[PDB]
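User: Is it possible to get a 3D structure for a protein together with its bound compound? The compound here is sodium ion. I've pasted both below.
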Amino acid sequence: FAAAAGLXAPQXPAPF
Ligand code: NA
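Assistant: Yes, that's possible. Here is the predicted structure of the complex:
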């Protein structure tokens, strides 16, 4: 779970 958040996180801005 922790890993999931951290690996996803830098892509969160892509649409914004
Ligand atoms: Na990115």
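Residues 4 and 16 are 20 Å apart (CA to CA). The pocket of sodium ion is lined by residues 10-11, 14 (CB under 6 Å).
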